């Protein structure tokens, strides 16, 4: 594992870790290439971003409940939809490209599921679930969160298959979001691991944080609560990483890079980490307030939703800016 890239490239041709060093180089570079502005508005109102299933379109939710889809190659608006009576706060299309989950701010229903084949219409609503998310292995079920309670529904019947809550073990996490493990066998809610078949609480993790609920690592071996990495098998504390403090953490499609994004109360930067050993790769400082980010499945584009202007000013103009992963500007470039 030579530190210098050129030495690693030569060794690959004749004597084949190096992928970690390659990721430190690639996922430390983001050059901005495009800005998406809400059509016909002097001050854009974007609140949420996600890519289309075939990622031909950037899906941008607005502060007034609209969902506006833009062609990534051309930037021109392709379609608009009315989803909620408050700002979109979350978006998640299905892999097959047939369904979409949305989440609002205060209007009801807070969350909903939408068809995306021929007519964009509501399939089912999750009236008081403020966050909503698909199952991982098979995208057949929907898991929503109401405070400290977790609800699981079926994406065709719409009916509540079960309800996970345990007031004795609960941590009452501020930003609680229930989620599946990659096998759908387990669910973490409010810092409590659940066995899905038995509807029984397996284990309650200790509370060193007030806001963050926690995620499953895509490797199936670890559990990431804020700054704490728990071994999924033994429940022992594996690492502590202060940089992940209070950060929304996303994984790239292959689960080898971890993004995290944060006077003014919001953040101006996002960090990348090697997903396999949590060492920090880079801290990319946008000069602006950030409210959402998402990656594509190709590790090509990163969409970030940025507030234009001064940080403490908190102007209303909020745009979405595309970066190209692994790409940088040279001095000779800027002429």
């Amino acid at each position: 594992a030579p530190i210098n890239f050129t030495s690693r490239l030569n060794r690959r041709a004749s004597f084949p870790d190096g992928g970690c060093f390659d990721r430190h180089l690639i996922f430390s570079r983001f050059r901005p290439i495009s800005v998406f502005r809400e059509a016909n508005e002097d001050e854009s109102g974007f609140t949420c971003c996600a890519f289309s299933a075939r990622e031909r379109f950037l899906m941008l939710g607005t502060c007034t409940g609209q969902l506006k889809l833009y062609n990534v190659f051309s930037g021109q608006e392709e379609a608009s939809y009315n989803c909620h009576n408050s700002a979109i706060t979350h978006l998640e299309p299905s892999r097959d490209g047939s369904l979409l989950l949305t989440s609002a701010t205060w209007s009801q229903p807070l969350s909903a599921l939408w068809g995306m084949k021929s007519v964009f219409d509501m399939k089912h609503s999750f009236t008081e679930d403020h966050y909503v998310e698909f199952s991982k292995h098979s995208q057949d079920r929907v898991i929503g969160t109401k405070g400290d309670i977790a609800h699981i529904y079926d994406i065709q019947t719409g009916n509540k298959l079960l309800t996970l809550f345990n007031p004795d073990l609960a941590n009452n996490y501020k930003r609680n979001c229930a989620t599946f493990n990659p096998t759908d066998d387990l669910v973490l809610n409010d810092g409590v691991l659940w066995d899905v078949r038995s509807a029984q609480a397996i284990h309650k993790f200790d509370k060193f944080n007030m806001n963050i609920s926690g995620v499953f690592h895509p490797n199936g071996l670890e559990v990431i609560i804020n700054t704490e990495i728990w071994d999924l098998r033994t429940f022992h504390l594996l690492h502590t990483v202060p940089a992940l403090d209070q950060c929304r953490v996303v994984f790239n499609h292959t689960g080898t890079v971890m993004y995290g994004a944060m006077k003014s109360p919001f953040g101006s930067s996002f960090r990348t980490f090697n997903a396999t050993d949590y060492k920090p790769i880079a801290t990319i400082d946008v000069k602006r307030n950030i409210f959402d980010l998402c990656t594509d499945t190709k590790d090509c584009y990163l969409a970030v939703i940025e507030n234009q202007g001064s940080m403490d000013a908190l102007n209303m103009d909020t745009v979405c800016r595309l970066y190209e992963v692994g790409r940088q500007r040279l001095a000779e470039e800027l002429a």
Partner: peptide, 16 residues
Amino acid sequence: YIRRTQTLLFRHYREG
């Protein structure tokens, strides 16, 4: 006014 206020509500909930 509605854009501004919905934007302020969105940021308020995000802050807590």
